[PDB]
Motif scaffolding. Structure first.
Motif, PDB file in Angstrom:
ATOM      1  N   UNK A   1       0.826  -1.223   0.000  1.00  0.00           N
ATOM      2  CA  UNK A   1       0.000   0.000   0.000  1.00  0.00           C
ATOM      3  C   UNK A   1       0.859   1.273   0.000  1.00  0.00           C
ATOM      4  N   UNK A   2       0.169   2.417  -0.064  1.00  0.00           N
ATOM      5  CA  UNK A   2       0.840   3.690  -0.248  1.00  0.00           C
ATOM      6  C   UNK A   2       1.816   3.985   0.909  1.00  0.00           C
ATOM      7  N   UNK A   3       1.631   3.376   2.089  1.00  0.00           N
ATOM      8  CA  UNK A   3       2.528   3.638   3.217  1.00  0.00           C
ATOM      9  C   UNK A   3       3.925   3.087   2.943  1.00  0.00           C
ATOM     10  N   UNK A   4       3.997   2.109   2.040  1.00  0.00           N
ATOM     11  CA  UNK A   4       5.262   1.566   1.557  1.00  0.00           C
ATOM     12  C   UNK A   4       5.675   2.175   0.196  1.00  0.00           C
ATOM     13  N   UNK A   5       4.981   3.219  -0.290  1.00  0.00           N
ATOM     14  CA  UNK A   5       5.247   3.927  -1.538  1.00  0.00           C
ATOM     15  C   UNK A   5       5.759   3.000  -2.640  1.00  0.00           C
ATOM     16  N   UNK A   7       5.266   3.170  -5.787  1.00  0.00           N
ATOM     17  CA  UNK A   7       5.648   3.856  -7.010  1.00  0.00           C
ATOM     18  C   UNK A   7       6.961   4.627  -6.861  1.00  0.00           C
ATOM     19  N   UNK A   8       7.503   4.770  -5.638  1.00  0.00           N
ATOM     20  CA  UNK A   8       8.695   5.588  -5.411  1.00  0.00           C
ATOM     21  C   UNK A   8       9.793   4.858  -4.625  1.00  0.00           C
ATOM     22  N   UNK A  11      13.234   4.468  -6.647  1.00  0.00           N
ATOM     23  CA  UNK A  11      13.816   5.787  -6.820  1.00  0.00           C
ATOM     24  C   UNK A  11      14.407   6.239  -5.491  1.00  0.00           C
ATOM     25  N   UNK A  12      13.658   6.041  -4.402  1.00  0.00           N
ATOM     26  CA  UNK A  12      14.117   6.473  -3.099  1.00  0.00           C
ATOM     27  C   UNK A  12      15.364   5.692  -2.685  1.00  0.00           C
ATOM     28  N   UNK A  15      18.302   6.827  -4.603  1.00  0.00           N
ATOM     29  CA  UNK A  15      18.711   8.148  -4.156  1.00  0.00           C
ATOM     30  C   UNK A  15      19.465   8.079  -2.824  1.00  0.00           C
ATOM     31  N   UNK A 146      14.388  -0.474   7.228  1.00  0.00           N
ATOM     32  CA  UNK A 146      12.942  -0.560   7.147  1.00  0.00           C
ATOM     33  C   UNK A 146      12.525  -1.031   5.756  1.00  0.00           C
ATOM     34  N   UNK A 147      13.309  -0.691   4.731  1.00  0.00           N
ATOM     35  CA  UNK A 147      13.039  -1.163   3.379  1.00  0.00           C
ATOM     36  C   UNK A 147      13.357  -2.652   3.282  1.00  0.00           C
ATOM     37  N   UNK A 150      10.704  -5.062   4.375  1.00  0.00           N
ATOM     38  CA  UNK A 150       9.585  -5.382   3.505  1.00  0.00           C
ATOM     39  C   UNK A 150       9.823  -6.679   2.717  1.00  0.00           C
TER      40      UNK A 150
END
Ligand code: V3U
Ligand code: V3U
Ligand code: V3U
Ligand code: V3U
Lengths: 262, 301
Positions: A1-5, A7-8, A11-12, A15, A146-147, A150
């Motif tokens: 879901x969006x809390x795990x972004x 779409x980004x 990229x994150x 970066x 944290x990534x 997942x």
């Protein structure tokens, strides 16, 4: 879901990988520091661990503060009597960056046993800001962890807490951990935690994400494994005490594995 | 940061925030026109404001044509000056000056497309803006529009953790903040851009509430009161109340009557209740609404 972004997240991650090399401290700054030692820094970081638990600061804040301190001490020679002032100003800046409710400056002056005045803390704040040129959004071990979390199948809260704990242990000891990037310490910590709790290993999926293999993580792993084994004897104990708490599932009490088979 | 106030000539005041005043100035050596935002530290008791620490740190990293450019930071003992590229007007002032003609569709479409580009760049660099509203969107004479005012912005981690509540100016605030959700993410910035999209078409705010609960009720009366089908989880949200009136969803054709089918499609996806189903800025750039997009200059002086 969006809390795990979704779409980004890539990229994150990409970066943060670029930014960790830019915000990286000099691996050999302690030798060029005349009055301060790895051991003095260990005392300071251990103290900032206690400060964080007393004010119930995020772990991210602690990590940022250490990043600021290490970058500062990479270009600025500091007397032992002022090491704590640097640390306090670092923790203030990290708290303002990262916390919803940062402690007031008076509270920072208070935790230094009135070793320093409010005017000293504020002046140092400005100095750290000048030295770092306001580059405060630094990647931390935790932002990578944290990534990595997942990719757990399934998610284990003991794995997560133990990984966090190990990453925190690494902040204490500039030798050897100054030589490893946050992304790599996080990977070592994640694998060690996973192996310890579930017997499993660094997954294929994080090989895809990171490009790191057990081969490329091995040096850091061998260090983190020794740090874990020796942790009950280390002069600094604030992190072990902190991770006895149930908030962290008591992971400091888990027994380290005797061998990694790696 | 190579700057020093002596090379700047103040021209006029152009505004003010909680931070202080903003001046338009001119660099006397290069000719460049800039916006100078003064932050007072002598009048600061807690040292450098957290708002300014976030604005400076985050804007330093965000180099993009649809994000206002911080050129420099002049960091005296007395004062802190943020030096920005100068942009002539904000979108709220332009809408008020487009009063009885409206903003032409090519310009709405150009502006929305640029805003999404800017916002996607933010989200790709782990930055939430958290105060997108027309007052904070700046336009130049060349047709550019740019995200500004990053004092309420924040560097997020993945997944997000709990951040400050009741962020975002109320009219532009997402339902998940209003219902006190433990977590919010990039979707709150899209929600604001949705409101702004609608507002560019009508020239009036879409949900002008006078209170948190009034804001919710206005949203619910337009989009229908959300249930578990449209938004799994909603009835468990901290400030969800079962006594909420249950308004039927209205056809979007009636929410912004002049909008074409593609426009309605995109708007609907920006204002989806479920943050997980709400469209990302990245995906929105591909929406058919933008098929014919150009970057024309603003029609007014
Ligand atoms: C924990 O180690 C004790 C030594 N020590 C204690 C406090 C401070 Br402040 C500096 C210092 O060096
Ligand atoms: C040329 O004068 C330099 C000093 N200066 C210039 C502009 C602003 Br806005 C404030 C200020 O103090
Ligand atoms: C929303 O902007 C208010 C303050 N500000 C900031 C930068 C620039 Br360029 C113009 C300006 O007006
Ligand atoms: C249908 O429920 C009304 C809920 N409500 C109404 C007013 C205020 Br102030 C707070 C609040 O929660």
């Amino acid at each position: 879901g969006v809390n795990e972004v979704p779409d980004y997240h890539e990229d994150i991650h990409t970066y943060l990988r670029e930014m960790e090399v830019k915000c990286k401290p000099k691996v050999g700054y302690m030798k060029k520091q005349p009055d301060i030692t790895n051991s003095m820094r260990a005392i300071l970081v251990d103290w900032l661990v206690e400060v964080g638990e007393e004010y119930k600061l995020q772990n991210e804040t602690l990590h940022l503060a250490v990043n600021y301190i290490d970058r500062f001490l990479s270009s600025m020679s500091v007397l032992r009597g002022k090491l704590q002032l640097v640390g306090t100003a670092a923790m203030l800046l990290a708290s303002k960056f990262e916390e919803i409710y940062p402690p007031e400056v008076a509270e920072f002056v208070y935790i230094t046993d009135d070793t320093y005045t409010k005017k000293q803390v504020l002046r140092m704040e400005h100095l750290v800001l000048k030295v770092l040129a306001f580059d405060l959004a630094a990647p931390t071990i935790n932002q990578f962890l944290t990534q990595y979390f997942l990719h757990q199948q399934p998610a284990n809260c003991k794995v997560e807490s133990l990984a966090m704990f190990l990453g925190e242990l690494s902040l204490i000891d500039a030798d050897p951990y100054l030589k490893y990037l946050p992304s790599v310490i996080a990977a070592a910590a994640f694998h060690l935690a996973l192996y310890t709790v579930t017997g499993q290993s660094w997954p294929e999926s994080l090989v895809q994400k990171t490009g790191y293999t057990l081969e490329t993580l091995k040096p850091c792993l061998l260090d983190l494994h020794q740090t874990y084994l020796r942790a009950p004897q280390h002069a600094q104990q604030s992190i072990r005490e902190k991770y006895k708490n149930s908030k962290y599932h008591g992971v400091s009490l888990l027994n380290p594995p005797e061998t990694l088979n790696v | 940061g190579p700057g020093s106030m002596e090379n700047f000539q103040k021209v006029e005041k152009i505004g003010e925030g909680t931070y202080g005043v903003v001046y338009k100035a001119r660099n006397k050596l290069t000719g460049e026109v800039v916006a100078l935002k003064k932050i007072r530290l002598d009048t600061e008791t807690e040292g450098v404001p957290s708002t300014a620490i976030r604005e400076i740190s985050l804007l330093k990293e965000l180099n993009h044509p649809n994000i206002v450019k911080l050129l420099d930071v002049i960091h005296t003992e007395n004062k802190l000056y943020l030096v920005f590229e100068f942009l002539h007007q904000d979108l709220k002032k332009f809408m008020d000056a487009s009063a009885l003609t409206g903003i032409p569709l090519p310009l709405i479409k150009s502006y929305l497309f640029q805003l999404l580009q800017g916002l996607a760049f933010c989200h790709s660099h782990r930055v939430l803006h958290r105060d997108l509203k027309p007052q904070n969107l700046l336009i130049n004479t060349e047709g550019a529009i740019k995200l500004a005012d990053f004092g309420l912005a924040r560097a997020f981690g993945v997944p997000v953790r709990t951040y400050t509540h009741e962020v975002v100016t109320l009219w532009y605030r997402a339902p998940e903040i209003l219902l006190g959700c433990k977590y919010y993410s990039t979707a709150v910035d899209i929600w604001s851009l949705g409101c702004i999209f609608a507002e560019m078409v009508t020239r009036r705010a879409l949900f002008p509430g006078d209170s948190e609960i009034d804001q919710l009720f206005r949203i619910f009366r337009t989009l229908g009161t959300p249930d578990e089908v449209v938004w799994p989880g909603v009835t468990s949200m901290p400030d969800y109340k079962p006594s909420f009136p249950k308004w039927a969803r209205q056809d979007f054709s009636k929410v912004v009557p002049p909008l074409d089918e593609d426009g309605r499609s995109l708007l609907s996806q920006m204002l989806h209740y479920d943050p997980n189903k709400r469209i990302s800025a990245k995906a929105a750039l591909a929406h058919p609404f933008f098929q014919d997009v150009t970057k024309p200059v603003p029609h007014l002086r």
